[PDB]
Amino acid sequence: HHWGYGKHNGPEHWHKDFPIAKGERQSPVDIDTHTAKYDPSLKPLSVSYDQATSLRILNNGHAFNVEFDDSQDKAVLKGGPLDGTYRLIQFHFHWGSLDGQGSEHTVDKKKYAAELHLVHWNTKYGDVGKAVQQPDGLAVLGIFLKVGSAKPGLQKVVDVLDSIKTKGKSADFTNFDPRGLLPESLDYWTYPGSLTTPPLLECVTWIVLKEPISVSSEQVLKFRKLNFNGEGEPEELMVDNWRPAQPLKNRQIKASFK
Numbered sequence: 567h568h569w570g571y572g573k574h575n576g577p578e579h580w581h582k583d584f585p586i587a588k589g590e591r592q593s594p595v596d597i598d599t600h601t602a603k604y605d606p607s608l609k610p611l612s613v614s615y616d617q618a619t620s621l622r623i624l625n626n627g628h629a630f631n632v633e634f635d636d637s638q639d640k641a642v643l644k645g646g647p648l649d650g651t652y653r654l655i656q657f658h659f660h661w662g663s664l665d666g667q668g669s670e671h672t673v674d675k676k677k678y679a680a681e682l683h684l685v686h687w688n689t690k691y692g693d694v695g696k697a698v699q700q701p702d703g704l705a706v707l708g709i710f711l712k713v714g715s716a717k718p719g720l721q722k723v724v725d726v727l728d729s730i731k732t733k734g735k736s737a738d739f740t741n742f743d744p745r746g747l748l749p750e751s752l753d754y755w756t757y758p759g760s761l762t763t764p765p766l767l768e769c770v771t772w773i774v775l776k777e778p779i780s781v782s783s784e785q786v787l788k789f790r791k792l793n794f795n796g797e798g799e800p801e802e803l804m805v806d807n808w809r810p811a812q813p814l815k816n817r818q819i820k821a822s823f824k
């Protein structure tokens with residue numbers, strides 16, 4: 567049936583319907599800090615989210631997405647290893663059933679509690695649909711979450727979760743500022759990859775921040791109370807919606823810092 571994260575439709579089965587799963591630039595990958603190359607020509611990231619307009623939060627059966635109005639250059643990402651302007655379209659998380667797992671990318675094999683993905687698309691392509699067909703169509707900003715102190719900025723997200731408990735449910739989610747989810751440093755690693763969920767298209771430039779943000783145990787606990795199923799179906803807790811690290815193959819991970 568449809569793909570998921572369970573025994574019978576999880577990541578190890580994806581290749582049957584999405585051959586690209588065994589591709590050359592699949593994500594996520596493990597970031598080996600001792601072999602990542604410092605590239606002094608990498609420009610600083612330019613995150614301009616002051617004009618971001620969030621619209622809705624949705625449980626899509628795989629995770630929960632917070633959607634933004636991307637009809638204009640309101641919230642953009644430029645700089646870094648990017649050429650062109652990329653508009654923020656949505657953000658979501660991947661998390662685990664336990665604090666020791668949840669992230670998709672790993673650093674020196676270390677797994678974090680969760681991983682935030684801020685998804686952006688290259689404006690030169692006109693729409694997201696066209697951007698996914700290009701090798702540089704998307705830019706995903708990845709931020710690791712570790713359990714510790716509460717992140718004030720994440721609480722509005724946490725509080726609205728009860729409203730979108732099951733697949734298909736959505737709630738109005740305006741005036742959310744994504745700047746409240748960024749760590750203080752924007753140092754990062756970058757490599758060419760893919761979407762980590764089917765269709766697994768290899769159109770992503772990954773920008774993974776070195777500094778994780780901390781969230782309280784109570785905050786991540788609420789992520790774990792969401793459901794993969796729709797209303798009236800057998801309850802399956804939405805946990806461990808992450809894909810294991812893929813082989814790096816002929817790729818090099820660059821670092822913006824020494």
Ligand SMILES: NS(=O)(=O)c1ccc(C(=O)NCc2c(F)c(F)c(F)c(F)c2F)cc1
Pocket residue numbers: 621631633634635636637655656685686687694695698704
């Ligand atoms: N401007 S808006 O009306 O608020 C709007 C909000 C969300 C989406 C969406 O989530 N589609 C998913 C989606 C992506 F988020 C991608 F990044 C992508 F590449 C896709 F192909 C895709 F279908 C589209 C438009």
Ligand SMILES: NS(=O)(=O)c1ccc(C(=O)NCc2c(F)c(F)c(F)c(F)c2F)cc1
Pocket residue numbers: 683685698706760761762763764765767
């Ligand atoms: N975790 S992550 O790598 O940052 C990631 C970000 C966005 C998307 C996404 O927009 N997929 C929706 C989507 C569809 F639902 C389609 F049906 C389709 F054809 C797409 F191209 C598409 F992007 C998937 C994974």
Ligand SMILES: [Hg+2]
Pocket residue numbers: 697698699700701702703767768769770
């Ligand atoms: Hg592509």
Ligand SMILES: [Zn+2]
Pocket residue numbers: 658659660683762
């Ligand atoms: Zn993701």
